[PDB]
Design a binder for this molecule. Structure first.
Ligand code: CDL
Ligand code: CDL
Ligand code: CDL
Ligand code: 9YF
Ligand code: 9YF
Ligand code: MQ7
Ligand code: HEM
Ligand code: HEM
Ligand code: HEM
Ligand code: HEM
Ligand code: FES
Lengths: 28, 74, 89, 531, 58, 377, 53, 107, 55
């Protein structure tokens, strides 16, 4: 019965990020 | 830790719990209710419910301790 | 909550899939094709209209009504029989 | 014709094995006749049912996780890809005559086994039968409770359906995986790899039909051997003492009572297995990691665990590069509970310093502290059990899910304290009621108005009068209604429609009255002489 | 009183009926929201359809 | 007592003597019907008889119903389904009624005809008499002292060493077959061999592998590619990692691969299209600002608490809910757990479209997916 | 070299007489022998249940 | 230490269960020492082994007649249609450390 | 192959060949014809639990 800790790698951001580029797949 | 006048069948079985156990139990229960306010929830109605119940428990423990400290309650 | 589906005719099921009212995901005609929607309608009606085979269906929820029935019928009857067979004091 | 056969068989048996002294000792053994002393027997009889039906179920179940297509008789699952265990369970339910009945009787017997173990534990705990010399017998009982819980868990996990598979994935996989240092090692020792493996069901089947049943059988044998050779406890009473047992001999009263109770328990289990549906697997479908259902609860004897996991508030720790998840708490929780159940007699022995030999039970009212603790634990267990079922409660009784979650969270603190207080005061108040009866006599409910206007109640003293001389409490129940002391008389003998001739009524009533006086006189003489 | 046990029954019926009617706040829809007079059309299954009103009635 | 006077004891005297030998005194035992020839005795006898006869007739009913009732399963909404539904309740009724009636008859016989008795037995418990305790202690001590093992320390030490070593070796050779390293690299990946818990079916395997988000049709070809316009706003989809080289379920190896991707515990993904009127409310996680393709977000369908499928999407609150323990994650805040026992956000899968427009995964999960463990983070 | 006595064969007469007395006392005091209908119905019911099961 | 401890354990056992007479009767039971009276013992002891190893075998065997393709380490049988039981027996032989030894000891 | 041949020769052929109740015994035991589906599980339940318990 003790306290809580937030996950060290679960922060939020403010950058909106770029739209994903169209995908192309290598033959193999 | 009790008398026949308080617990008639005291000789027959375990019939007394030291008041320290109850006092620290109340304090720990209040601390648990308070510490449950840290976590994941947007709303704050539950925080007020926890605060109210912790306040009631602390008030009960404080009154009982004060009355045993002054002599009225034994 | 998501309501009990038993008392709903097929068109209501189809239009609930088709237009998710509130906190229901919306199932479009390409996410769920009309044949898929009709299959789901058929299964829902079949499950509503099928009688329980093992006896009395305890609400169709699983172990919770089963445990309540055991504690309130089986255990009550067992304890009553024990009280009948045994003695007091 | 059978008397000569009986005599010749007895002569042959005695000439070959000479069991006469031992058989006579076992036939003359005296067992007290209190109803609560039957509670444990229920857990025995259901277990026997669990053996019998269990063997039947082993003749048709294939516990293979290999995947096949159904092509059975159940149309709403035709062409569905399922494991071999699920298909064989379906074949039991649909393709074997009486297979559904045997499955349901087996599951109902498991539920009654768990419930009766719990009620017997309550009896043992509140009467104080765990006291010296019966501490090890309490330890054996606690081990049996844990084993039965996990045996039933594995049992309903055997048919790989959606609900049981979801329960496996949640508890047996998630909790195990998160343990601090060895969690993943335990998970990969148990499952042979990741959770959706290929060996889990055969392993659980072997554990559940052979290993755990064998351990439980050995522990029940040792348990009953201890109960037999450490003669049964008893409640304080007229002819009772720490150095004797007052009751009935084995032959024939106890044997016939036990056999008839077995038959009646089998009747109850058969009726429930026929008339009530339990675990309708075909409605759940084969287990699929991508599907789950809203009503995800285990069998009730495990429900508390889930309730704990539902109520503990997302407390996780992150040491140097490592994660300690919330599920760890749950594991520790269970551990502590089991620990606190196994070593209770020694805890109370340390706390009260009471290490004396005890054969006379305690009424729960005479031990207000232990009764308060037991009520507290029962309240906490019930609260966790209902918090496991809080989604169904929310659906049926209109209440929000967050409301039930927070009621459970606050309750697992507030409610046990209230229940402790109420139970303690209630036990002491029952003591006071006993003392009031002993000191004034039973209240007969009859009110007289004296010539000067005094409304008095007629009291029936239980001893002599000087107003009665106040008797001394002797740890035994007291009468508080006059119909229970015989004042209510007897009805006219007959057939509920036609009386018997008054001569037969007189003969029977006089004979019964004489027999009652003779029995009470015999008990009084034994009590007077021994004391 | 003439019926001492019927008296205690009356008291406990009071306590538990009052608790049942007040427990409508526990419902997400809330307790009865149609007045204490419970006028007819406003109280139907259509208008005021929650469970707090049903708990009120019972 | 001698044989001559044993020959001249009545049965009651012999019972008394036998009980007295065992330590039992029957201080009360009286016949249930002292008064001969009454109608009440006849009535009670017939009552016990009727209960046993009801048990017999119910056992006969069990035999008949089992042998002759129509028991085979009948399809939905057809004739004979009522008789099939009654099949098992009739087995239960007949069996339970028969054995319960037999038990009731036995109880009634005990209560009404077997004489009531009150026997008293002496416990003889506690310490044994000093003769027994001393003799058994002397026998044990004499065994240990005549063995001479105490005064031979080399033999005792060697025996302890050898027994402990054999026990340790046997225990290790017993448990050792079950011990598996969870971190042995066994899963191929576009970055070598990796442990199972670090990988799922979304992990690319040859550095540019096209992994399609395929819906489960629940049927030959149970998975099919899907396009972004196949999800209406506020709609939810369960997608799986399906590649071209997995097949369409016709060939047996194709079915094996499709089964192994449908049964992957970390495979299912929840794909949700946010309504544009709410896309301003989206808060994005650091390092995942570019994982959505417009209005379509993709998260794991595995709860971060204990691995159940958190598969309840409430669109009007954008809340992902897990029914196993009632965890709530906010789909507008990178699936951050806003309620319940979950303390970690759901993993977000990067998605985009290929040249044809079919939705594909734009990489792997940027973290482990399921419930946490020691070696995470 | 230890020698133990068998004490086998038939029991001493007191034990045999007392065991036979206890068993016949149970069977006789139960008065089931003079209840023809109860015994017959018990046999029939037990056999019917056994056949059905 | 291990003398007073043994005395205390004996006193506790005798006060709780009073087996001294029965235990002494069991300790003083005389057994003839002929070698052939050991033959039955063998049948007992091997049985115990059959239990122990047997339990071990239940932790890895799958009793199924469902058809599978082997796909294992033992090359001469790869790609062969077999049953799930035969496959798991081969897995006991080849995939589990000490599985072949336990199998052979059991047989 | 060896133990399957043994099952076919002894457990199946001899059981099948018996008079009046022979084929009935075979079909009760194998659940059908000889290459059934409920033979290995049945023998497993007889062999790890039933017969060892009786023994
Ligand atoms: C809305 C609808 C309503 C409908 C309902 C209608 C009902 C009407 C409601 C209104 C009624 C109005 C009044 C009615 C009449 C009542 C009055 C009456 O009759 O008596 C007079 C009444 C008598 O009270 P008093 O004068 O104070 O004397 C007290 C007694 O003498 C006591 O004597 P004592 O000294 O022996 O006390 C013993 C002990 C009381 O003992 C206890 O209660 C403790 C309970 C548990 C014990 C510990 C656990 C057991 C050990 C196991 C573990 C070992 C370690 O004292 C305390 O400690 C009190 C504090 C409690 C703290 C404990 C809290 C937590 C316990 C720890 C358990 C943890 C749970 C573990 C589960 C695991 C979780 C993971 O007088 C009053 O009226 C006082 C007013 C009340 C004070 C309130 C002031 C606070 C401010 C407002 C609140
Ligand atoms: C819904 C449930 C209730 C919740 C709502 C409550 C609303 C709050 C109202 C507060 C009442 C204030 C008026 C009383 C002042 C108390 C002090 C006093 O009287 O001094 C005289 C007292 C006289 O000395 P004395 O000569 O030795 O006493 C011998 C006499 O026999 C002394 O006579 P005694 O021993 O017989 O006791 C008298 C005195 C001494 O006893 C005490 O120790 C009182 C200590 C706590 C009392 C409440 C103050 C704190 C409440 C927290 C706020 C709750 C919200 O005070 C009381 O016990 C009265 C409390 C209960 C009165 C009514 C009880 C039943 C009627 C209720 C109707 C039906 C129930 C529904 C509720 C409706 C309520 C309207 O001096 C003291 O030092 C006693 C105080 C002991 C201090 C120990 C620490 C106590 C812990 C309290 C801390 C609470 C934390 C604050 C909350 C922060 C969160 C925001
Ligand atoms: C609507 C609810 C109907 C409730 C009916 C209660 C109204 C009766 C009030 C006047 C009776 C006076 C009285 O002393 O009652 C005795 C007793 C009061 O005990 P006390 O204080 O010691 O009085 C001392 C007397 O001297 C002791 O007098 P006593 O020992 O000579 O008692 C004589 C007689 C006194 O009883 C009567 O007065 C006969 C009235 C029969 C009422 C039948 C109820 C019909 C249900 C309508 C629902 C539609 O009781 C009997 O011997 C047998 C009748 C009791 C069975 C009650 C019917 C079972 C109710 C289950 C209904 C479920 C079916 C629907 C599904 O009250 C009752 O026995 C009835 C209580 C019913 C609880 C209400 C449950 C809701
Ligand atoms: C041991 C006694 C049991 C007797 C069994 C012996 C009878 C012999 C043959 C039995 C054949 C089976 C009976 C009928 C076959 C059958 O199953 O009939 C259901 C009906 O069920 C109901 O509600 C009716 C409730 C009335 C039953 C009352 C008895 C219940 C007792 C056992 C509970 C006591 C324990 C109390 C617990 C709490 C006490 C402590 C506080 C269908 O109701 P339905 O109208 O379609 O709606 C459903 C919805 O879940 C939904 O609406 C859904 O949409 C529908 O699909 C359907 O499932
Ligand atoms: C009372 C118990 C006291 C004795 C315990 C037994 C001794 C523990 C060590 C076992 C002895 C070593 C035997 C082989 C172990 C070994 O050396 O493993 C290696 C890596 O070990 C290591 O470095 C050391 C292991 C560290 C132990 C971790 C402790 C976690 C334990 C406590 C949790 C398991 C609980 C088991 C409960 C059983 C549940 C089921 C009822 C890598 O494994 P892997 O590369 O996957 O290869 C696999 C073959 O090893 C392997 O045989 C297998 O047969 C192959 O299939 C292959 O997968
Ligand atoms: C957790 C919580 C506070 C819940 C409150 C919800 C609630 C019951 C509100 C009632 C209003 C109130 C508070 C009234 C107070 C006055 C009093 C003392 C009333 C007592 C009467 C009560 C509380 C009855 C409720 C009993 C109760 C909650 C039982 C648990 C529910 C269970 C186990 C249901 C299981 C169950 C289900 C769900 C079926 O569908 C089903 C279908 C067919 C046969 C059987 C069953 C079955 O047993
Ligand atoms: C499978 C589990 C169990 C079985 C089959 C079982 C069976 C029995 C039976 C038949 C008795 C004698 C009659 C009676 O006391 O009711 C008994 C006594 C006892 N049991 Fe259990 N029980 C089980 C679980 C438990 C548990 C959970 C506890 C704790 C426990 C502790 C005891 C104790 C201390 C006694 C002695 C009672 C006395 O001497 O008065 N047992 N058990
Ligand atoms: C305390 C003892 C036992 C308990 C509590 C228990 C409990 C259970 C439960 C609840 C099920 C689920 C059945 C269903 O949902 O259909 C089950 C399944 C099963 N049980 Fe048991 N059981 C016990 C002992 C045994 C024994 C001794 C055997 C074999 C001799 C056995 C054989 C089986 C089999 C084969 C199954 C799976 C087949 C099926 O589900 O139809 N069980 N068990
Ligand atoms: C699993 C099978 C068996 C086991 C475990 C077993 C074990 C034993 C043991 C340990 C003894 C006492 C020591 C000895 O005389 O060697 C014994 C004695 C005996 N055995 Fe067996 N045996 C088995 C099979 C058989 C068979 C096939 C027969 C025939 C048989 C008949 C007897 C008899 C009559 C005795 C009493 C001999 C005497 O008292 O001197 N047993 N058995
Ligand atoms: C008298 C007792 C027993 C006898 C004579 C016996 C005999 C055998 C034999 C000869 C085999 C063939 C082993 C092989 O070829 O690999 C076998 C296999 C097996 N035994 Fe036993 N057994 C006995 C008891 C048990 C018990 C008690 C268990 C479980 C607790 C068990 C579990 C198994 C299993 C699972 C197999 C198949 C696994 C395998 O073949 O590798 N056996 N048994
Ligand atoms: S597994 Fe999702 S909340 Fe527990």
């Amino acid at each position: 019965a003790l306290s809580a800790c937030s996950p060290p790698g679960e922060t939020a951001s403010s950058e909106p990020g770029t739209t994903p580029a169209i995908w192309t797949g290598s033959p193999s | 830790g009790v008398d026949v006048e308080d617990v008639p069948s005291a000789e027959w079985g375990w019939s007394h719990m030291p008041i320290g156990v109850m006092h620290i139990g109340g304090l720990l229960s209040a601390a648990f209710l308070l510490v449950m306010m840290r976590g994941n929830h947007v709303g704050h109605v539950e925080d007020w419910f926890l605060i109210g119940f912790a306040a009631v428990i602390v008030a009960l423990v404080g009154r009982n301790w004060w009355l045993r400290r002054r002599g009225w309650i034994r | 909550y998501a309501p009990d589906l038993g008392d709903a005719n097929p068109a209501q099921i189809y239009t609930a899939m088709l237009t998710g009212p509130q906190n229901m995901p919306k199932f479009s005609d390409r996410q769920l094709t009309p044949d898929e929607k009709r299959d789901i309608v058929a299964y829902v009606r079949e499950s509503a209209e099928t009688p329980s085979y093992g006896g009395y269906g305890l609400g169709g929820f699983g172990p919770a009504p089963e445990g309540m029935a055991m504690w309130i019928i089986g255990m009550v009857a067992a304890i009553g029989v024990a009280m009948w067979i045994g003695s007091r004091a | 014709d059978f008397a000569k056969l009986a005599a010749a068989q007895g002569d042959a048996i005695d000439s070959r094995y000479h069991p006469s002294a031992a058989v006579r000792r076992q036939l003359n053994k005296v067992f007290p006749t209190h109803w609560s002393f039957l509670l444990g027997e229920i857990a025995l009889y259901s277990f026997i049912i669990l053996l019998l039906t269990g063997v039947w179920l082993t003749l048709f179940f294939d516990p293979s996780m290999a995947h096949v297509t159904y092509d059975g008789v159940y149309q709403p699952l035709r062409g569905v890809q399922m494991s071999r265990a699920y298909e064989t369970a379906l074949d039991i339910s649909f393709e074997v005559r009486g297979g559904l009945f045997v499955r349901q009787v087996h599951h109902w017997a498991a539920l009654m086994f768990a419930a009766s173990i719990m009620v017997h534990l309550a009896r043992i705990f509140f009467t104080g039968a765990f006291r010296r010399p019966r501490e090890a017998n309490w330890v054996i009982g606690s081990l049996l409770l844990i084993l039965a819980m996990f045996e039933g868990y594995f049992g309903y996990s055997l048919p790989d359906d959606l609900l049981s598979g979801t329960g496996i994935r949640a508890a047996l996989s998630g909790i195990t995986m998160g343990m601090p240092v060895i969690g993943t090692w335990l998970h990969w020792a148990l499952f042979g790899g990741d959770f959706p493996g290929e060996i889990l069901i055969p392993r659980l089947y072997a554990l559940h039909i052979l290993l755990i049943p064998g351990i439980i059988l050995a522990l029940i044998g040792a348990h009953l051997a201890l109960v037999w050779f450490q003669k049964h406890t008893q409640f304080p009473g007229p002819g009772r003492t720490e150095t004797n047992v007052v009751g009935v001999r084995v032959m024939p009263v106890f044997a016939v009572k036990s056999g008839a109770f077995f038959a009646m328990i089998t009747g109850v289990l058969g009726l429930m297995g026929g008339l009530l549906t339990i675990n309708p697997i075909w409605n759940l479908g084969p287990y699929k990691p991508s599907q789950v259902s809203a009503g995800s609860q285990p069998d009730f004897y495990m429900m508390w665990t889930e309730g704990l996991a539902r109520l503990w508030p997302a407390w996780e720790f992150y040491p140097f590069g490592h994660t300690i998840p919330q599920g760890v708490w749950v594991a520790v929780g269970m551990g502590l509970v089991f620990a606190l159940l196994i070593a209770y007699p020694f805890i109370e022995k340390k706390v009260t310093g009471d290490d004396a030999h005890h054969n006379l039970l305690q009424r729960p009212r005479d031990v207000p502290v232990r009764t308060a603790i037991g009520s507290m634990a029962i309240a906490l267990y019930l609260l966790l059990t209902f918090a496991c079922m809080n989604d169904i409660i929310a659906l049926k009784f209109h209440i929000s899910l967050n409301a039930t979650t927070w009621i459970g969270r606050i309750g697992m603190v507030v409610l046990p304290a209230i229940v402790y207080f109420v139970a303690y005061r209630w036990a002491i108040s029952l003591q006071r009621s006993d003392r009031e009866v002993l000191e004034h006599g039973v209240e007969t409910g009859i009110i007289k108005r004296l010539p000067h206007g005094a409304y008095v109640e007629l009291h029936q003293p239980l001893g002599p009068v000087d107003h009665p001389i106040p008797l001394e409490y002797a740890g035994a129940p007291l009468p508080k209604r006059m119909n229970k002391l015989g004042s209510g008389g007897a009805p006219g003998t007959g057939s509920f429609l036609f009386p018997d001739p008054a001569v037969e009524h007189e003969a029977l009533t006089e004979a019964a009255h004489a027999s009652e006086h003779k029995s009470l006189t015999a008990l009084k003489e034994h009590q007077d002489r021994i004391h | 009183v003439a019926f001492p046990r019927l008296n205690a029954l009356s008291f406990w019926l009071f306590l538990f009926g009052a608790l049942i009617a007040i427990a409508g706040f526990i419902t997400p829809g809330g307790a009865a929201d149609f007045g204490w007079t419970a006028y007819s059309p406003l109280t139907d299954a259509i208008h005021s359809p929650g469970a707090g009103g049903d708990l009120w009635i019972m | 007592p001698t044989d001559a006077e044993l020959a001249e004891m009545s049965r009651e005297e012999l019972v008394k003597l036998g009980g007295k030998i065992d330590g039992v005194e029957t201080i009360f035992k009286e016949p249930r019907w002292p008064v001969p020839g009454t109608k009440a005795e006849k009535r009670t006898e017939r009552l016990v008889a009727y209960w046993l006869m009801l048990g017999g007739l119910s056992g006969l009913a069990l035999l008949l119903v089992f042998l002759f009732w129509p028991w085979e399963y009948q399809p939905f909404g057809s004739e004979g389904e009522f008789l099939y539904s009654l099949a098992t309740p009739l087995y239960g009724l007949t069996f339970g009624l028969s054995i319960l009636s037999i038990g009731i008859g036995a109880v009634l016989f005990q209560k009404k005809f077997i004489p009531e008795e009150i026997s008293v037995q002496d416990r003889h418990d506690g310490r044994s008499p000093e003769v027994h305790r001393k003799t058994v202690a002397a026998n044990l001590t004499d065994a240990l002292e005549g063995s001479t093992l105490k005064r031979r320390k080399v033999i005792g030490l060697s025996l302890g060493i050898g027994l402990g070593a054999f026990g340790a070796g046997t225990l290790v050779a017993f448990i050792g077959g079950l011990i598996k390293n969870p971190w042995k690299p066994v899963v191929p990946t576009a970055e070598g061999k990796k442990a199972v818990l670090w990988t799922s079916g979304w992990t690319p395997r040859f550095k540019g592998e096209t992994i399609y988000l395929a819906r489960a049709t629940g049927r030959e070809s149970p998975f099919v590619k899907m396009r972004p316009e196949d999800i209406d706003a506020g709609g939810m989809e369960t997608v799986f990692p399906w590649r071209e080289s997995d097949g369409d379920g016709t060939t047996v190896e194709s079915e094996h691969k499709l089964t192994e991707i449908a049964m992957g515990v970390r495979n299912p993904v929840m794909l949700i299209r946010i309504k544009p009127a709410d896309m301003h409310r989206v808060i994005k996680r650091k390092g995942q600002e570019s994982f959505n393709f417009g209005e379509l977000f993709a998260y794991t369908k595995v709860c971060s608490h204990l691995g159940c499928p958190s598969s309840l999407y409430e669109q009007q609150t954008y809340r992902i809910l897990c029914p196993c323990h009632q965890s709530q994650f906010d789909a507008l805040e990178f699936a951050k757990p806003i309620f319940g026992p979950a303390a970690r956000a759901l993993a977000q899968l990067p998605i985009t479209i290929d040249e044809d427009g079919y939705l594909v995964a734009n990489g792997d999960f940027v973290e482990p997916v399921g419930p946490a463990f020691w070696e995470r983070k």
